[PDB]
């Protein structure tokens, strides 16, 4: 019966909780009771990038650690040169309600999306000197929240409906559709090996997917509100999440569980962006109370504060070589810290 | 102290800044407003009339119209799910929200009031005014005159209600219709005056879908909202 199946599922649900308790033997805080504290980290603004006309929602770094792309709700993508603060390209968009941006690892393409239900791919290297739309991807029934490249002919997108998709750019179709969420999906993070990814949705749950099969291997719970940002530790065996309950958490893929909670009583506002440093020792988070914040990823102590923005921080990224951190806000400014 | 190639890169970056300064003028001279409503509410016909004058899963539609040489952009979200709490945050800089509600349902009216309450008490939609259209007044007048279905079996407070002294009846309409149409308006205003705090306001209007004056009403109402902001910006209150 339907009730019996639910009872069977509940009995099956009780089994999972037993396994988690058995493997728990200690805490990360306990094992980190001897490592010397990092201390205090002073970040100072090096560059301020002016030019956008409205709120800034998205930002991605290039692989060369010098070029940068940003999106605003005025209809513009600007490609910057971080070292010189001069503008390389300015791409006008067909829709103006943009919410995501991406930069291809090769360096040829950029992508954008938003409330128009469409992921658009631009070609930055043509025989002529202008940027053109190479492909418009359609097939989602809800707003796009994140998009990430895998190579020049594959991309992964997450949308308002509880689904994520893998696309073939040349053809224009959906190779695999990932289903199993019950709420709006808000983020994606590709693993360094580019064979797994994690999504966090507005149902207090995060899931792990296999790109070449289409199945969900693990489900991670523990939050209480919406999850807005997710990222991998630079090893492929851990990921961090930010939510609207003013907390961040760290999970482990091989011993599925929670390890640390990054919370403090002075702050009540939610988290809007999460990233790691190159070594995995610093975890940076952006907040709704107009300032960014820096955490130590093994002791849960606030190490530093970045405070230079007059409105909320929306995007945050760390370069590949680890020499800079860029933050965008709703004051129409990008700031590079070092 | 700069090379020939690096000197020509700055010149390119200055022909971009010029074009981005010609777009700040158009952006600042155009007003953006968001249209909200239900399925039974006739928000589509208002779009048709305002466009007639002055992809299959697309989720946003835009309409241009100008009155007295000021440009207006109207946005209608069409293909998104029922949950709303996440994409409203993108609309915290618009001039106004137009909330179009049917007045002849009498059974879906309660669900309309709860929807208005959530928009008014949102954390991101403060300092944003609402221009509500009490649509479909032609159908409402017929229903009350025939007297087949009463307005007292869904709101018991109707019997104790009397027409306010500040009324303004149209020429030649049954006072029963006037009493009915002002009761529905007062339900929506009870929500507005509970938590306004003077940061944003609610502008009522009675409309029919065929009316050609809807464009003028928005223009008059917007002219008040920008005025109110300028008194704060220029330090007068």
């Amino acid at each position: 019966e339907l009730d019996q199946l639910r009872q069977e599922a509940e009995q099956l649900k009780n089994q999972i909780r037993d396994a988690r308790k058995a493997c728990a033997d200690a805490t990360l805080s306990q094992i980190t009771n001897n490592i010397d504290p990092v201390g205090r980290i002073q970040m100072r603004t090096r560059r301020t990038l002016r030019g956008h006309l409205a709120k800034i929602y998205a930002m991605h770094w290039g692989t060369d650690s010098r070029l940068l792309v940003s999106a605003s709700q005025d209809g513009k993508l600007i490609i910057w040169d971080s070292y010189t603060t001069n503008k390389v390209h300015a791409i006008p968009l067909r829709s103006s309600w943009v919410m995501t941006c991406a930069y291809a690892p090769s360096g040829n393409y950029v992508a954008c999306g938003g409330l128009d239900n469409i992921c658009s791919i631009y070609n930055l290297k043509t025989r002529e000197g202008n940027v053109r739309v190479s492909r418009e991807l359609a097939g989602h029934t809800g707003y796009l929240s994140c998009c990430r490249f895998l190579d020049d002919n594959q991309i992964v997108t997450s949308s308002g409906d509880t689904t994520c998709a893998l696309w073939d750019i040349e053809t224009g179709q959906q190779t695999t559709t990932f289903t199993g969420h019950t709420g709006d999906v808000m983020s994606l993070s590709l693993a360094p090996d580019t064979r797994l990814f994690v999504s966090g949705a507005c149902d207090a749950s995060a899931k792990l997917w296999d790109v070449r099969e289409g199945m969900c291997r693990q489900t991670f719970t523990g939050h209480e509100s919406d999850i807005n940002a997710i990222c991998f530790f630079p090893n492929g065996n851990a990921f961090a999440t930010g939510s609207d309950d003013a907390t961040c958490r760290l999970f482990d893929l091989r011993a599925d569980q929670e390890l640390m909670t990054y919370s403090h009583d002075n702050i009540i506002c939610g988290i809007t962006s999460v990233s790691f440093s190159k070594s995995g020792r610093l975890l940076l988070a952006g907040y709704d109370d107009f300032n960014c914040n820096v955490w130590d990823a093994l002791k849960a102590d606030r190490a530093g504060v970045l405070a230079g923005h007059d409105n909320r921080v929306s995007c945050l990224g760390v370069t590949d070589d680890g020499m800079a951190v860029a933050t965008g806000s709703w004051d129409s400014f990008l700031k590079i810290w070092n | 102290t700069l090379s020939a190639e690096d000197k020509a890169a700055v010149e390119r970056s200055k022909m971009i800044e010029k074009q981005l300064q010609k777009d700040k003028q158009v952006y600042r001279a155009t007003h953006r407003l968001l249209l909200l409503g239900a399925d039974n509410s006739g928000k589509s016909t208002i779009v048709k009339q305002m466009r007639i004058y002055h992809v299959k899963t697309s989720g946003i539609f835009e309409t241009k119209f100008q009155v007295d040489k000021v440009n207006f952009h109207m946005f209608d979200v069409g293909a998104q799910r029922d949950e709303r709490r996440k994409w409203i945050q993108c609309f915290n800089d618009v001039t106004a929200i137009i909330f179009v509600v049917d007045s002849s349902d009498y059974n879906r009216l309660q669900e309309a009031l709860n929807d208005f309450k959530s928009i008014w008490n949102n954390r991101w939609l403060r300092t944003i005014s609402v221009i509500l259209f009490l649509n479909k007044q032609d159908l409402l007048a017929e229903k009350v005159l025939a007297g087949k279905s009463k307005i007292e079996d869904y709101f018991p407070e109707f019997a104790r209600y009397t027409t306010p002294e500040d009324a303004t009846p149209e020429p030649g309409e049954d006072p029963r219709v006037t009493r009915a149409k002002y009761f529905i308006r007062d339900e929506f205003l009870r929500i507005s005056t509970a938590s306004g705090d003077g940061r944003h306001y609610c502008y009522p209007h009675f409309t029919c879908s065929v009316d050609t004056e809807n464009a003028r009403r928005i223009f008059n109402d917007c002219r008040d909202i920008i005025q109110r902001m300028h008194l704060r910006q220029y330090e007068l209150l």
Partner: single-chain antibody
Amino acid sequence: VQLVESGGGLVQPGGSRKLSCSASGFAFSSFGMHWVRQAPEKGLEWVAYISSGSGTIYYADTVKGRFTISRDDPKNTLFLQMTSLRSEDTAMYYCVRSIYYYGSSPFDFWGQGTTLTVSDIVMTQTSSVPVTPGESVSISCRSSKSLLHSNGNTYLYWFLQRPGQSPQLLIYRMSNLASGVPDRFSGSGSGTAFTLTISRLEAEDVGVYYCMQHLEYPLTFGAGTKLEL
């Protein structure tokens, strides 16, 4: 893309003529353009340069005062004005396309050229080399000043001219390989010492080679190294 130019002819001494190049197939308004000329049996020499937006105009030493350059963006044509011609102005003039931003490749496309007849970081190059298919050639040209700027990139460019054709780009900034050229071509060197290496030589790549500098104006070319089969 295509660039076709016209205006050449016979011009009596002390006269004047106008040259125009028509552009079709690319974003003309966002591209600066140059002018180069070639004597009847000699190398290349730079003439003028008009930038995007017409905010930067440079002329060569043997050019200032006599020649005037201009462009017409909406009509997609640029004009060169010639006044008081002499006997040293007999050459075939070329129009060259160039853009400048991070990672750009200037001097990409070269036109067919127009014929006209009338009635400083010096670059030294080597004048011939025998060519047998399968061998590996090495062409070297030296410079009178270091081309390695402080930013970190060297401004040396390599060009190739097959018989009866316009020059084509091979290598830009001494290490980068042009778009559309085979991977056998390679370039390397240091300050004031450059070399171009070709591995596994095949037919249809014999001709003259040129090396150009771009650290500061005016741009200086080389005599030309000829490979014959």
